Design a protein around this nucleic acid. Structure first.
Ligand SMILES: [Zn+2]
Ligand SMILES: [Zn+2]
Lengths: 273, 273
RNA sequence: CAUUUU
């Protein structure tokens, strides 16, 4: 007979006059930051804007002296939700250049936690660490968009690992299950190593006292990292790929995922050797 | 003995220069578009730039007269991979403002196919329809990131349908399985309706004659759409949420996912009533 | 859907 109705007519909008913009919920004004340190205040003023990323370079062996000054904002700002929201906006709309920059920043920051005997916890109010889960999800989304030849044209592709780690995160954000799975094999692909680097901080933050062994594995990964590894791994893999992939279309699919340049809104620094 | 080695050291790149960019090849110069229609040529020149979206508004009463002239570029351009890669770059880095604009464009374009008895094909070389799957995946990514009060604070949330459709697309791009699931129920939430609108053209493109029932359902959805509905549905939902949700954290997180303005790079027109 | 993929 007649078909089943498609939808209830009551859910359609009350007005059919054209809307050119979505609502912007303007939010309260920011309080003054709680520091008089003019280097730290300058770093925050530049983090608020999309500065060319070369201007934000910070040599990693100078980061130790800057860590405690920068904590006055990164850990103790009165504008916590404003800063986290700013950074999540950039990450949720990030190309792979932007993802890579934020990953290197977060991992160098995490290594300073270790150097200073800080513990990792989700109640720690840290505007860099508290966007690391959003960043892991974004990295997985970029890897799933790349043509499959990027994973298959590595010396030891470990494609089954890439596929299962991406499924666990994309399907239901199963962060600790992804660590459990990564523990079962030696890592032999640089793409798998990027995923391990990206999972270690958001997993460590959510471990309870019943998951001390998983926490310990996350700290092994964090300690092996060296400043700049995420940018260095991707720069090398993408160059080799252009020199060997025979597809007539891969380069165009890939350029759109990688992007033209990074967006540094919310990024305090790009750490390098 | 020691624990299992973390990774084979050979996968790390040689330390060399500090990396401040990621490599992509440079684009060749453009060929001339195959038309002398000044109106079409002007629309394509604007499409190349992130100009304010009010300057790209098109009343959908005019789209039927412009459809055939515009095919000279959308369907027969000698610059196919330039246009599709430009549009996929914008969509893969898109906030929800941008996703909504491109969805309305694609749905109105698909309606002109239907009105003219054109068929939908994976190899049809259409720079608008060939980005509709990327757009579906990005809409699902945005819905997953919104605080869940957005889906639950609806008259009839159908929260189980939203979650399962999002699972099917995000886990394995199971587009036809998502249509099959949607066809079982009357749609009673605006969020579910947005997902139905976003799925109908990517599904129509990959249906064969062995999926004639699912194809018919996709054509039912496409015919019921009214130009501008994606922006109008999202504007009403976000306006009424802002009035009713009491969470301060929700406002900050929502602003991050929605964004403050659309990126129109690669967008030809924003269709409206 | 009831942890759905491998
Ligand atoms: Zn390739
Ligand atoms: Zn809310």
């Amino acid at each position: 007979g007649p078909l089943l109705k498609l939808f209830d007519i009551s859910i359609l909008p009350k007005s059919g006059e054209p809307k050119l913009f979505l609502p912007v919920p303007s939010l309260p004004c920011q309080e003054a930051e709680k520091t008089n340190d003019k280097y730290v205040l300058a770093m925050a003023q530049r983090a608020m804007h999309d500065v060319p990323i070369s201007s934000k370079q910070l040599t990693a062996n100078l980061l130790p002296v800057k860590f405690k000054p920068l904590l006055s904002i990164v850990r103790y700002t009165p504008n916590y939700y404003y800063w986290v929201s700013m950074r999540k906006e950039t990450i949720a709309s990030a190309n792979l250049c932007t993802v890579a920059a934020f990953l290197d920043e977060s991992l160098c920051w995490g290594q300073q936690y270790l150097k200073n005997d800080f513990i990792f916890s989700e109640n720690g109010k840290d505007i860099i660490l508290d966007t690391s889960s959003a960043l892991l999800s974004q990295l997985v989304h970029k890897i799933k968009m790349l043509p499959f030849c990027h994973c298959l044209m590595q010396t030891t592709p470990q494609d089954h690992i890439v596929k299962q780690v991406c499924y666990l995160i994309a399907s239901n954000n199963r962060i600790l299950d992804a660590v459990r799975y990564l523990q079962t094999s030696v890592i032999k692909s640089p793409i798998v190593l990027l995923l391990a680097y990206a999972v270690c901080l958001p997993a460590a933050i959510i471990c309870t006292k019943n998951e001390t062994q998983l926490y310990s594995h996350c700290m092994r990964i964090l300690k092996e990292y060296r400043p700049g590894d995420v940018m260095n791994i991707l720069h090398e893999s993408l160059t080799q790929h252009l020199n060997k992939c025979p597809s007539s279309t891969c380069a165009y699919t890939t350029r759109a995922i990688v992007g033209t340049k990074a967006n540094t809104t919310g990024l305090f620094f790009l750490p390098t050797q």
